[PDB]
């Protein structure tokens, strides 16, 4: 309920309050850093997909009116939540027949990936190229 | 007929007879300062479209052979004639989601745009950038 209510602010309330978005997403940065059950809970809410959509507009509601919005904590949530996922489907080893190497850049202090990367998230990262340009 | 005969001079004679041009373009500067019934006629003759090609030496005839040709009134015809058209289909609102602001810089002494900005004019003014170099 606490996460659902905070995510409901993303409908209309968030796209009114630039100058003030650092602490909104920092709530998710802090909550993710808690542990696996917390990161699992955020993923099951499809938080990265909605968060990835925002800052590309197209979100659950209106675009953010303040154009000078500091969304640095929005990316940090997406960066942390995605790194706790499996991208094993989308790797090729550049040598025909060779299996792809293991990924060392997943989340440390996490034994095994939480879940295979979600389809709606893979569409924004790999299928499309808008988000990668945004964070870069 | 009169405008057609005056426009037939662009084929060869205008190129041959630089240094005598201010009074050849006041034929159109003063013919536009009349009203809306004339500017509509001028626009339907592609007067702006054939006048941007001139001074780009891409017109219906040879380039103007005189160095210090005074085309300052060739631009003032295109300026007045274009600022009667509709650029509605060519504005972006910057702040996403918002609609484009209304144009406060069109033609005074005139209620509504005569016509949507026509194609060949848009391809010389917007799509290309030779004319904008020339007038600046």
Interacting residues of B134 by C-beta distance below 8 A, sequence separation 6+: B55, B56
B95 to A62: CB separation less than 8 angstroms, yes or no: no
Give the technique used to solve this structure. cryo-EM
Record the resolution, in angstroms: 3.3
Tell me the nearest-neighbour CA distance from B99 into chain A, angstroms: 13
Q: Could you count the other beta carbons within 10 Å of the beta carbon of residue B124? A: 21
Chain B partners within 8 Å of A62 (Cβ): 97
Tell me the nearest-neighbour CA distance from A73 into chain B, angstroms: 21
Question: Closest residue of B to A62, CA-based?
Answer: B97
A·B CB contacts under 8 A: 9
Q: What Å distances lie between residue B33 and A62, B26, B38, B71, B76, CA to CA?
A: 46, 10, 9, 18, 11
Burial of B94 (0-12, 13-18, 19+ CB in 10 A): exposed
Chain A partners within 8 Å of B94 (Cβ): 67
Closest-CA residue to B85 (of B37, B39, B27): B39
B97 to A63: CB separation less than 8 angstroms, yes or no: yes
Cα–Cα distance for residue pair B64/B56, rounded to 1 Å: 10
Beta-carbon-side half-sphere exposure of residue A13 (alpha carbons within 13 Å): 9
Question: In this complex, is the C-beta atom of A66 within 8 Å of any C-beta atom belonging to chain B?
Answer: no
The alpha carbon torsion through B34, B37, B39, B45 (nearest 10 deg) reads -130
B97 to A67: CB separation less than 8 angstroms, yes or no: no
Chain A partners within 8 Å of B92 (Cβ): none
């Amino acid at each position: 309920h606490l996460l659902r209510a905070v995510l409901n602010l993303l409908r209309r309330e968030v796209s009114e309050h630039g100058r003030h978005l650092q602490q909104y997403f920092n709530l998710f940065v802090m909550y993710a850093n808690l542990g696996v059950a917390e990161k699992t809970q955020l993923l099951k809410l499809s938080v990265p997909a909605t968060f990835m959509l925002v800052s590309l507009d197209e979100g659950p509601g209106p675009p953010i009116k303040y154009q000078y919005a500091e969304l640095g904590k929005l990316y940090s949530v997406v960066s942390q939540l995605i790194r706790c996922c499996n991208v094993s489907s989308r790797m090729q080893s550049s040598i025909n027949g060779n299996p792809p190497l293991p990924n060392p850049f997943g989340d440390p202090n996490l034994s095994q990936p939480i879940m295979p990367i979600q389809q709606n998230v893979a569409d924004i990262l790999f299928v499309r190229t808008s988000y990668v340009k945004k964070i870069i």
